Amino acid sequence: SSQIRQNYSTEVEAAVNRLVNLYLRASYTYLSLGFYFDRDDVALEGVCHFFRELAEEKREGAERLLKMQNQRGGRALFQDLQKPSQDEWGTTLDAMKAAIVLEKSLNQALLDLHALGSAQADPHLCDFLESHFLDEEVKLIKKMGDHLTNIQRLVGSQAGLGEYLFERLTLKH
Amino acid sequence: SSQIRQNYSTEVEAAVNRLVNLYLRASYTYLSLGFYFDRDDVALEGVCHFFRELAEEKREGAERLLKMQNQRGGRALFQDLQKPSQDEWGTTLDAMKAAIVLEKSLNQALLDLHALGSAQADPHLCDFLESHFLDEEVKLIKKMGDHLTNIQRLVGSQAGLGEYLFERLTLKH
Amino acid sequence: SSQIRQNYSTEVEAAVNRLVNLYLRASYTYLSLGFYFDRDDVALEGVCHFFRELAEEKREGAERLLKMQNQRGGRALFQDLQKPSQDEWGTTLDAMKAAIVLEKSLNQALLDLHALGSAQADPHLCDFLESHFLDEEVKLIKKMGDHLTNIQRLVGSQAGLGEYLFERLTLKH
Amino acid sequence: SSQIRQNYSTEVEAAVNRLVNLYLRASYTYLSLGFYFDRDDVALEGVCHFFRELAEEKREGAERLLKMQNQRGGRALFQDLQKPSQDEWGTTLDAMKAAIVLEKSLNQALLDLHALGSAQADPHLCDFLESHFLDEEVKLIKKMGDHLTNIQRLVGSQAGLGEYLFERLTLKH
Ligand SMILES: [Ir+3]
Ligand SMILES: [Ir+3]
Ligand SMILES: [Ir+3]
Ligand SMILES: [Ir+3]
Ligand SMILES: [Ir+3]
Ligand SMILES: [Ir+3]
Ligand SMILES: [Ir+3]
Ligand SMILES: [Ir+3]
Ligand SMILES: [Ir+3]
Ligand SMILES: [Ir+3]
Ligand SMILES: [Ir+3]
Ligand SMILES: [Ir+3]
Ligand SMILES: [Ir+3]
Ligand SMILES: [Ir+3]
Ligand SMILES: [Ir+3]
Ligand SMILES: [Ir+3]
Ligand SMILES: [Ir+3]
Ligand SMILES: [Ir+3]
Ligand SMILES: [Ir+3]
Ligand SMILES: [Ir+3]
C-alpha cells in the first residue's frame, strides 16, 4: 500500500526525494566545513561551530521532508550522496561565500518544488514548504549575508587579524 | 448588515456553510461509531474512545468554520444533518475503513474549497484552511492508515484475538 | 600544517577516513530502515524508532572518528556515500538480520583498524577504539541477537501477530 | 619488602622513575614560563595563567606515576631536577613553540614506556598510560597547536597588537 495517498502526484513525490538528497548533501558539506575549521592549522572554533550547527539543521530538514513524504503516502527513495565540492575550504570568507551559494541552491529547489505543487494544485505541499522551509532559508541567507559583509570589512590589509576578530567577536559562543 | 465583508464571495460563503454541514455530519458519524463500540456485545473501550475523540474534533472543526464565516461577514446557514450511514459498524477493521473513507471525503471538500478560494483570489480563506485543517487531515489520515495496517496484520486466523490485542495495545489509554 | 602530528601513520589516517565513510553509510542505512517502518503500509513505530536511534548513534561514531583524526593531526577526507542496499526492508525479521550483518561489518572494520594500529605501535588509536567503539559494538550486537531470537520465536504460524507483539512489547517506548 | 610485586620488571620500574623526573622537569619549566609572563615588562596575565595551570597538571602527572610505582611494588627514586632551558621566554609565540616541543617530548617518553611495557607483557602499565596520560597529551598538544595557529595569524605587521588580542580574547579568563 498506500491506503492514504490523496492529491499527491508522482511528480511531487519524486521532487521531494530529490530535495531530501539535496538537504542531505548540504548536511554533508557542512560536516566537512566544520571539521576543516577544527584542523589545528586552521583553528577557528566559532567557524567550526557555525558549520556543525548548519549540518544538523540540514539533516533535520531532510528528516522533516521524509516524514512528510510518508504522511502523504509517497515512498522515500534514497540515492547516493555525493561528496562535498572541496576537501579544503580556504578562509572564513571563502567558506561563507560557499555556504551562501549552497543555501541559494537549496532555496531555489524549494521555490521550484513550491511552483510544482502550485501547478499540481497541492496546497498541503505548498503550506508545508512555506511553514517549515522558506522563511528558514530567508532568515539563514540574511544571517550569512550579514556575516559576509562583516568578514569583508575586516580583511583590510590585516587579513589574519580580521579573521581572528570575526571568529572571536561575532561567532564564538 | 455586514459592515465588514471584503473580498468574500457568495460562492465561498455557501461552500463554507456546506463544509460546516459535512463536519457536523462527520461528528455525528463518530458519535454513532463511539457508542457502537460501547455496546456490551461489542465492548472495545479503546475503539469507543478513539471515535468519541474524533466526534469532538469534527465538532470543533465545524465551530472554527462558523467563527470564520462570521469574521468574514458571511452568514451561517444550517441544514438538516443526515443520520450516519450505518446503525451497526461491524468489526474495528470495518469501522477504521469507514473512518478513512469519511476523512478522505472531508479532505477532498477542503481541497475543493481551497481551489475555489484560490479561483476567487481569497488568500485569507486559503491560509485559514491551510493553517487549521489541511495538515490536521493529513496527520489524521496517516494515523488511520497506520491503524488499518496494524489491524489487518492481526486478523491472522485468530480475528477475535487480534481485535482484542489491537484495542488493548494500540488504542486503549 | 599540522604542527602536532606524532606517531600517526598515513596508513592509519587513511583507514580512519574509510571508517568514517563506513559509519556514515551505516547511518544512512538506518535512516532508510527507520522511514520504511514509518510507511503507512508497514506502520511499526517501535521498529522505526529503534532504527532512527541507530542512525543517530552511527552519525555520532563518525563524528567522534573525525574529531580524533583532527586531534592527531590527520586530515579528514570525505568520499561519496553510497545509498543503502535496499529500498524496501521486508519484515522486522529481515531488517534485524540486515542490521546484524551491518554491525558485524562495522565491527570487523574496527578490529582491522585496531590490528593496524597495533602493527603501527599506535597505542592512542588502540585505546581510542577500545574505549569508544569496541564495547559499544559488542553490546549492540548482543541486543540485536536477543531481538532476533525473540522475533524468530514469534513467527509461529501467526507471523503478523508476532510482528505486532514484538513491536508492542519489546520495542515500543 | 615488597610483598606485592608481580609482573613488574626492573626495566619498567626504572623507566617510570625517569618519566617522573621528566614530568617534574616539565612542571618546573611551566612554573618559569608562568612567572615570566607575570613580569611587569611582559604582563600577559592569560599567558601566565595558561602556564601555571600546566605546571600543576605536570606535577599531578608525576604524582600519579609515583602512586602507580608504589601500587606495583616498585621503588620511587628521585634525581636532581634540572633547571629549565631558558631564563627568559620571549614572546607568547616563542613560549607556545617551546611548550609544544616539551609536550612532544613527554609524549614520546610515554610512547616509549608503552612499548617497553608491551615488550615486557605488562598490560596494567599499558592500560595505566592509556587511561591517564596518552589522551591527555593528545588533547593538550591539539590545544597548543590551535593556539599556535591563532598566534601566528595575529602577528601580521602588528605583533604587539596581536599578542595583546590573543591574550585577551583566547586565554584570559
Ligand atoms: Ir503556493
Ligand atoms: Ir508539514
Ligand atoms: Ir551555540
Ligand atoms: Ir553550542
Ligand atoms: Ir492557496
Ligand atoms: Ir482562520
Ligand atoms: Ir504502551
Ligand atoms: Ir485519551
Ligand atoms: Ir481519554
Ligand atoms: Ir493498561
Ligand atoms: Ir591493542
Ligand atoms: Ir579518543
Ligand atoms: Ir526511546
Ligand atoms: Ir524515544
Ligand atoms: Ir599496549
Ligand atoms: Ir593507573
Ligand atoms: Ir569569550
Ligand atoms: Ir582558569
Ligand atoms: Ir583560573
Ligand atoms: Ir574580560
Range list of H helices, A38-134:
45-71, 92-119, 123-129
Give me the CATH number covering residue D150.
1.20.1260.10
Q: Helices A159-166 and A92-119 meet at what angle, rounded to 10?
A: 50
Cα(A50)–Cα(A172) distance, rounded to whole angstroms?
8
CA A108 to chain centre: 11
Ligand 2 centroid to Cα of residue A14, in Å, is: 17
Partner-chain contact A1 B149, CB within 8 Å: yes
Partner-chain contact A73 B145, CB within 8 Å: yes
Partner-chain contact D154 A163, CB within 8 Å: no
Q: Which residues have C-beta under 5 Å from ligand 6, the single-atom ion?
A: B 68, 128
Among chain C residues, the shortest Cα distance to B141 is held by C40
Q: How was this structure determined?
A: X-ray
User: Interior CA angle at A61 toward A15 and C38, to 5°?
Assistant: 75
Ligand nearest to the CA of D170: 17
Element (H, E) at D165: helix D159-166
Question: Within an 8 Å CB–CB cutoff, is residue A93 touching chain C?
Answer: no
- In units of Å, what resolution does this entry have? 1.6
Q: Can you read off the three cell numbers belonging to residue A5?
A: 495517498
Q: Which residues contact D13 (CB under 8 A, 6 or more apart)?
A: D69, D72, D74, D75
Cα(D138)–Cα(D134) distance, rounded to whole angstroms?
6
Partner-chain contact B153 C161, CB within 8 Å: yes
Provide the β-strand partners of residue A81. Answer: C81
Residues annotated in a binding site of B for Fe cation: 53, 56-57, 60, 63
Number of Cβ atoms within 10 Å of the Cβ of A121: 14
B128-B133-B134-B138 Cα dihedral, nearest 10 degrees: 160
Number of Cβ atoms within 10 Å of the Cβ of A139: 10
Q: Helices B135-155 and B159-166 meet at what angle, rounded to 10?
A: 140
From chain A, pick out residues whose CB is under 8 angstroms from the CB of C36.
76
Cα(D15)–Cα(D72) distance, rounded to whole angstroms?
14
Rg of chain C, C-alpha, whole Å: 18
Q: Do chains D and B touch (3 or more CB pairs under 8 A)?
A: no
DSSP 8-state code for residue A93: H
Partner-chain contact D141 C2, CB within 8 Å: no
Q: Which residues have C-beta under 5 Å from ligand 8, the single-atom ion?
A: B 173
Number of Cβ atoms within 10 Å of the Cβ of D27: 19
Partner-chain contact D144 C4, CB within 8 Å: yes
Cα(D102)–Cα(D79) distance, rounded to whole angstroms?
19
Q: Helices B159-166 and C159-166 meet at what angle, rounded to 10?
A: 20
Cα(C56)–Cα(C35) distance, rounded to whole angstroms?
13
C-alpha dist (Å) from residue C64 to C60, C72, C124? 6, 12, 14
C-alpha dist (Å) from residue C24 to A46, C12, C17, C126, D171? 24, 18, 11, 21, 35
Number of Cβ atoms within 10 Å of the Cβ of A59: 22
Task: Check if the beta carbon of residue B28 is closer than 8 Å to that of residue B92.
Answer: no
Count Cα neighbours of C86 within 13 Å in the Cβ-side half-sphere: 14
Among chain D residues, the shortest Cα distance to C70 is held by D142
Supply the DSSP string of chain B, one letter for each residue. --S---S--HHHHHHHHHHHHHHHHHHHHHHHHHHHHTSTTT--HHHHHHHHHHHHHHHHHHHHHHHHHHHTT--------PPPS-SS--SHHHHHHHHHHHHHHHHHHHHHHHHHHHHTT-HHHHHHHIIIIIHHHHHHHHHHHHHHHHHHHHHTT-HHHHHHHHIIIII--
Domain count, chain C: 1
Ligand 9 centroid to Cα of residue B47, in Å, is: 11
How many residue pairs from chains A and B have C-beta atoms closer than 8 A?
Answer: 47
Partner-chain contact A36 C81, CB within 8 Å: no
From chain B, pick out residues whose CB is under 8 angstroms from the CB of C157.
157
Partner-chain contact B129 A123, CB within 8 Å: yes
Partner-chain contact A38 C75, CB within 8 Å: no
C13 in a labelled binding site: no
Give backbone dihedrals phi and psi of D73, rounded to 5 degrees, phi first. 85, 10
Task: Check if the beta carbon of residue C154 is closer than 8 Å to that of residue C163.
Answer: yes
Question: Within an 8 Å CB–CB cutoff, is residue A70 touching chain B?
Answer: yes
Q: A93: closest CA among A169, A172, A167? A: A167
Residue of D100, D115, D142 lying closest to C71 (CB–CB): D142
Residue of D107, D114, D148 lying closest to C6 (CB–CB): D107
Residue B56, domain extent: 1-173
Q: D143: closest CA among A38, A48, C62? A: A38
Provide the β-strand partners of residue C81. Answer: A81
Cα(C63)–Cα(C106) distance, rounded to whole angstroms?
15
Ligand 15 centroid to Cα of residue C7, in Å, is: 14
Among chain C residues, the shortest Cα distance to D141 is held by C4
Among chain A residues, the shortest Cα distance to C36 is held by A76
Task: Check if the beta carbon of residue B94 is closer than 8 Å to that of residue B163.
Answer: no
Question: Within an 8 Å CB–CB cutoff, is residue B145 touching chain A?
Answer: yes
Question: Within an 8 Å CB–CB cutoff, is residue B169 touching chain C?
Answer: yes
Question: Within an 8 Å CB–CB cutoff, is residue B129 touching chain A?
Answer: yes
From chain A, pick out residues whose CB is under 8 angstroms from the CB of D167.
none
Give backbone dihedrals phi and psi of D88, rounded to 5 degrees, phi first. -125, 140
Partner-chain contact D149 A45, CB within 8 Å: no
